[PDB]
Amino acid sequence: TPDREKALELAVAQIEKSYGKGSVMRLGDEARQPISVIPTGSIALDVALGIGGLPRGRVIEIYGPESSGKTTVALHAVANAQAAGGVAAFIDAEHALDPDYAKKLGVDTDSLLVSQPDTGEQALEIADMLIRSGALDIVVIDSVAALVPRAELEGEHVGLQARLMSQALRKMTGALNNSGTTAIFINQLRTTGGKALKFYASVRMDVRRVETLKDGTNAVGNRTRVKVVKNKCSPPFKQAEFDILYGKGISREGSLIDMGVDQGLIRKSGAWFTYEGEQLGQGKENARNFLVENADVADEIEKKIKEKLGI
C-alpha cells in the first residue's frame, strides 16, 4: 500500500517531532550513531545498546539482584569515561564500594569524586550541583533503595520516597541534557525499578548472574547476562552476555571473541579459534589469554567488529 507507507512515514515523523527522536522505532531499525558514547567494557553489551555504549546527557538505570554485576557495569562506565579524559562522581548510600577492585578493572579512584550523603534529597541535590557545573562526564548514584528521605530519618508522609525521585528527576533531566553528563542510577530488585526512574531513564538495563565460571575446580568469576529492557536511543529488548572475572572485572577480551565468532570475523577449526588465517588459541581461555597478551590484535578485532556493525 504505497498510499499507506507515506501515511505511516508521516505519522512516525509527527510522533518523532512532537515527542523527540526515539519515541517510536521498528525493532529491526539501525541505530542513529551519536558523536560520543561511554563504552561499557563489553562489546556485546555495546552492540546491544545499538549506539556502542551508554548515551551522554541521559538518565540510565542499571538494576538486578545482589551479586549480579550491576555495580561492575557502572564502574566500567566510570573507567572508560575517565580513560577519555572525563571526570566522574560516585554518590554512595550503600557504603559497599571496593576501590581495589575498582582500580583493577580500570578506575582512576584517586580522581573519583565520592559523596556519602545523609539524606536521599541531599544525595540528589549534590548530584544536581555536580551536574550543573558542566565539569562531570558521569555520575553514579548507588543506590535508589538506600536513598532514605529526610522526614523518615528525623522521625517525622509514607510514599514520599517516590515523590522525592519524581521531583528531583524532572529537575535533574534538564540539567543532564544541557551538561552532556550521564547519570547512572544503580537499583536493587529484591525499589524494583524506581517509578519515576522507569520513565525518565533513556536506558534501563537488567543485570543477572547466569552461571559460575569454572576455574578447573574453583570459581574464577561469573557469566553475566544483561537485557536492555528500555532504550530510547536504539531498538530495545536486546541482550548480551559476558564474563565478570573475580578481581579483574568484565573480560573485554572474552567479549571480543564472542562477538568475533558471532559476526564470522573469527572462525572455528575444531576447538581452535582463528582470525585472519592466524590462530588465537585452543579453547576460549587461551584465545582470551592471547588477546590480553596481544593488545594490538585485540584492538584490530575490536576495530573490525565495530566497522562491520553500526559503530
Side-chain angles (χ1 to χ4, degrees), residues 113-149 151-155 158-160 162-166 168-170 172-189 191-213 216 219-247 249-266 269-277 279-287:
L113 286 165
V114 175
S115 174
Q116 294 185 308
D118 310 325
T119 66
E121 38 270 294
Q122 177 165 312
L124 296 161
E125 286 161 7
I126 286 166
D128 198 74
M129 256 165 259
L130 258 21
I131 292 154
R132 288 192 197 286
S133 85
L136 274 295
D137 282 18
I138 185 170
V139 54
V140 179
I141 293 81
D142 191 17
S143 58
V144 180
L147 300 176
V148 182
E152 190 178 328
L153 279 166
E154 291 176 340
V158 45
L160 43 47
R163 197 200 310 167
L164 163 60
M165 289 288 301
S166 292
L169 280 175
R170 178 155 84 160
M172 189 180 292
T173 287
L176 291 165
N177 186 241
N178 301 344
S179 63
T181 303
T182 307
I184 313 196
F185 289 81
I186 303 170
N187 200 8
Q188 200 130 295
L189 272 179
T191 49
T192 191
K195 343 79 222 296
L197 181 62
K198 180 171 171 181
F199 294 101
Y200 279 101
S202 302
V203 172
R204 297 179 76 240
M205 296 187 297
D206 180 331
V207 189
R208 299 203 168 102
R209 279 190 305 160
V210 185
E211 63 183 308
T212 304
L213 298 169
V220 293
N222 290 290
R223 171 114 284 212
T224 303
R225 182 175 300 166
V226 177
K227 186 183 179 198
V228 188
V229 304
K230 190 188 182 180
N231 196 340
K232 306 309 296 284
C233 301
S234 170
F237 309 131
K238 296 196 169 289
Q239 55 172 59
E241 298 189 8
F242 50 88
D243 300 340
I244 298 172
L245 303 171
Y246 290 134
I250 293 175
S251 173
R252 162 168 171 271
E253 287 75 21
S255 211
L256 291 168
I257 289 157
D258 292 338
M259 292 301 292
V261 316
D262 187 87
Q263 289 303 308
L265 264 51
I266 303 187
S269 67
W272 290 90
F273 287 90
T274 85
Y275 177 69
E276 212 96 310
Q279 73 192 31
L280 296 177
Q282 189 180 345
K284 189 181 183 181
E285 290 306 326
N286 284 320

Side-chain angles (χ1 to χ4, degrees), residues 26-31 33-98:
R26 301 171 217 256
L27 296 178
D29 285 353
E30 296 184 338
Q33 293 297 308
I35 295 152
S36 61
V37 300
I38 304 167
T40 59
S42 162
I43 189 71
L45 181 53
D46 291 348
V47 170
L49 290 155
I51 65 175
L54 296 174
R56 278 156 186 272
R58 322 297 265 201
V59 172
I60 284 62
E61 184 182 0
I62 314 180
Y63 68 84
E66 50 167 27
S67 300
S68 65
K70 64 199 182 297
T71 301
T72 295
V73 174
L75 290 163
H76 280 280
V78 171
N80 299 324
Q82 285 173 329
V87 174
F90 194 94
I91 288 56
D92 166 44
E94 291 282 7
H95 312 146
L97 177 64
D98 178 350

Side-chain angles (χ1 to χ4, degrees), residues 286-302 304-306:
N286 284 320
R288 166 184 291 154
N289 279 219
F290 184 82
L291 295 181
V292 63
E293 292 164 38
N294 296 112
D296 61 298
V297 64
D299 299 356
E300 229 274 296
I301 292 165
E302 186 171 296
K304 295 228 173 195
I305 293 164
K306 288 191 216 179

